[PDB]
């Protein structure tokens, strides 16, 4: 419906401008401060080291930035591997899920080339498995609800509301198991704050995958079940979330 | 079937293990290149500037890191949270692309971002479905004239439907995969391979963030920055349609 399509476009476009205004208002001041601090660091260094021109220091910083940008660590000079078997497994998962944290980058042209085909074939393959798991999980959840639904029906609450209450319980437990439980888990395991953990969870299950926060990249010795349980989690969560995201979509179309 | 999905799980798992083996084999030998480069930069600097200790240079590099980590940029207009870049960032959310080459630093930013996405993504998905239908219509409608030619050539109507799909994607591919990659090559001074990598990482919504095109506008070429936004919208739609139908083919299989 051409009229509706253009309305929708204008709406989103406003949803973006509105977002822009807010992120700017919330983040720019921190950013402008950091820019200031970098310049303070340069000027302080020049005053301490007369053998260095501003312009030369500039090149140093550019070069240092490029290396840090490639994942160099400021702290050390040189063991643990980002591409060990476990982390590479994880990386692949980030592709087919389309999450794409990207906290570790491919450096080789062959890596990139292979990655292209790996995804083209991997994502649809995964989408299929996901649909499957979504159906199977919803089924198991629906069967489970039935037994408690029996209790509500006896208590003479209308079948129309009992279905509604069950949804509340349905998501509330899902939420409990896939949103709340993991956030509490990650809090303790990753030394993130409550808010950081929820942020991570949600960024992840939406498949946005910023990459500022990442949980399951390497295993923890003295707690073996952690690393796989997280993978298992992403699979289930993504399925639970897919069911949700379409439905908040339905509410949105209605209004 | 539950049995079948368990089988499907195992397949994927193998697709992952197989992927792991390859990326490890391909990338592990360059794990440490960036360290090595940073160290080269330090050592080169020390040799040029005798008034600087290694340890002092160390602190400089820590302090620089902290500032870059807060969103500073090396200077020699680059604000990632000015109106234009914040717009772009919001786009990366609702599209679920999530390049993340610029991170949120504030707890308020994170909190707002949560709600912004929950509401934003489904809203965008709806617009995308809409654009997908409208674009597919335009495409399929054009193809209609060539479909008329095939039908006259007494090619079976079933193959004609197939050829049209090939065309359908192939023509899109030209406009949304090939054209942009050639565009970005020239505009971003990326290589052919880097450009395709970017395009595809983007339109799959993987959004690694190692390569990013449209975050800031380019003086001396105004149409660039919007055209890219326009491109992402169309490309994503073209790509979604492929996936839904290839998904469509797959689930019945």
């Amino acid at each position: 419906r051409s009229t509706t399509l253009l309305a929708l476009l204008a709406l989103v476009l406003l949803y973006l401008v509105s977002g822009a205004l807010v992120f700017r208002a919330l983040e720019q001041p921190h950013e402008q401060q950091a820019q200031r601090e970098l310049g303070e660091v340069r000027e302080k260094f020049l005053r301490a080291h007369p053998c260095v021109s501003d312009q030369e220091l500039g090149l140093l910083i550019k070069e240092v930035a490029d290396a840090l940008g490639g994942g160099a660590d400021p702290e050390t000079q040189s063991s643990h591997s980002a591409w060990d078997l476990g982390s590479a497994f994880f990386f692949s998962g980030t592709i087919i899920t389309t999450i794409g944290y990207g906290n570790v980058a491919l450096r080789t042209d062959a890596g990139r080339l292979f990655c292209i085909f790996y995804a083209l074939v991997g994502i649809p393959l995964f989408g299929i498995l996901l649909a499957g798991v979504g159906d199977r999980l919803g089924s198991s959840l629906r069967h489970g609800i039935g037994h408690i639904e029996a209790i509500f029906l006896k208590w003479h609450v209308p079948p129309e509301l009992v279905r509604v209450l069950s949804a509340m319980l349905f998501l509330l437990i899902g939420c409990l198991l896939f949103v709340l439980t993991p956030t509490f888990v990650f809090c303790y395991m990753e030394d993130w704050s409550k808010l950081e953990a929820i942020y991570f969870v949600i960024v992840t299950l939406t498949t946005v995958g910023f990459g500022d926060y990442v949980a399951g990249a390497d295993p923890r010795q003295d707690s073996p079940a952690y690393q796989p349980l997280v993978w298992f989690w992403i699979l289930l969560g993504l399925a639970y979330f897919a069911s949700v995201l379409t439905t908040i979509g339905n509410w949105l179309r209605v209004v | 079937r539950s049995t079948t999905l368990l089988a499907l799980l195992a397949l994927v798992l193998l697709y992952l293990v197989s992927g792991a083996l390859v990326f490890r084999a391909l990338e592990q030998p360059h794990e440490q290149q960036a360290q090595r480069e940073l160290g080269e930069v330090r050592e080169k600097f020390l040799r040029a500037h005798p008034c600087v200790s290694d340890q002092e240079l160390g602190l400089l590099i820590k302090e620089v890191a902290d500032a870059l980590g807060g969103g500073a940029d090396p200077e020699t207009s680059h604000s990632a949270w000015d109106l234009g870049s914040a717009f772009f960032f919001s786009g990366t959310i609702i599209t679920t692309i999530g390049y993340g080459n610029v991170a949120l630093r504030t707890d308020a930013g994170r909190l707002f971002c949560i709600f912004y996405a929950l509401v934003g993504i489904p809203l965008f998905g709806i617009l995308l479905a809409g654009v997908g239908d409208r674009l597919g219509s335009s495409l399929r409608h054009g193809i209609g004239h060539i479909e008329a030619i095939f039908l006259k050539w007494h090619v079976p109507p079933e193959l004609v439907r197939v050829l049209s799909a090939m065309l359908f994607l192939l023509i899109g591919c030209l406009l949304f995969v090939l054209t942009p990659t050639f565009v970005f090559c020239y505009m971003e001074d990326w290589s052919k391979l880097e450009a395709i990598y970017f395009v595809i990482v983007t339109l799959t919504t993987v959004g690694f963030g190692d390569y990013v095109a449209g975050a800031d506008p380019r003086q001396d070429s105004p149409a660039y920055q919007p055209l890219v936004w326009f491109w992402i919208l169309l490309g994503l739609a073209y790509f979604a349609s492929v996936l839904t139908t290839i998904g469509n083919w797959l689930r019945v299989v």
Partner: antibody
């Protein structure tokens, strides 16, 4: 007592080029950045460029990119500036001065006259 | 290409008078420096890092400011203070100068 001693006034024909020098004493030549500055009859000061005597590194004011070449002789702790294809617009006083953030010591200046 | 404006470009003071000359920057700057020049001779670093006095300089001189606005002050004018004063910045390359403020004796 840090000191920058510049060479004497120079008189050259339009079109010619010219080289002038600045010897330092009282400190270590290679430890500090050297700059050159132009002042045209008693008016604004214009930074021309700098050289790092220790590394050979130079950067220039965009205005002077084509015009001026900075070099140094480490052994004689002397800095040089060459100016090219001179016109009467180049007639001015030119200073060498030391510093990487403030210009803390200046040569006494040298006057260039471009004339037929 | 940060631009420094000194205005007015000319001023005059009787001895004993307090003198203040300003330097406004086109965009913010962390430190300002000042040079004194007397006709016939090269500039001398006079004040640096906004408010530090160079070795030779007597106490009646002071400097202050921040961000985009900086000033040089003489608590009490003297005769030997007649000169041209220049501000300059190097918080961004390339360094730049004000066009100078010429300070003559009143009589």
């Amino acid at each position: 007592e840090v000191q920058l001693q510049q060479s004497g006034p120079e008189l050259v024909k339009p079109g010619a080029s010219m080289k002038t020098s600045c010897k330092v004493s009282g400190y270590s030549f290679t430890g500090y950045i050297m700059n050159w500055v132009k002042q045209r009859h008693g008016k604004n000061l214009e930074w021309i460029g700098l050289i790092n005597p220790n590394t050979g590194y130079t950067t220039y004011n965009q205005k002077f990119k084509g015009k001026a070449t900075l070099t140094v002789d480490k052994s004689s702790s002397t800095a040089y500036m060459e100016l090219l294809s001179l016109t009467s617009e180049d007639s001015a006083i030119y200073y060498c001065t030391r510093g990487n953030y403030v210009f803390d010591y200046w040569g006494q200046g040298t006057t260039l006259t471009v004339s037929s | 290409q940060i631009v420094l404006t000194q205005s007015p470009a000319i001023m005059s003071a009787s001895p004993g008078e307090k003198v203040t000359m300003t330097c406004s920057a086109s965009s913010s700057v962390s430190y300002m420096h000042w040079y004194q020049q007397k006709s016939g001779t090269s500039p001398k670093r006079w004040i640096y890092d906004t408010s530090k006095l160079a070795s030779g300089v007597p106490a009646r001189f002071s400097g202050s400011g921040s961000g985009t606005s900086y000033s040089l002050t003489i608590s009490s004018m003297e005769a030997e203070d007649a000169a041209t004063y220049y501000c300059q910045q190097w918080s961004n390359s390339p360094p730049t100068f004000g066009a100078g403020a010429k300070l003559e004796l009143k009589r």
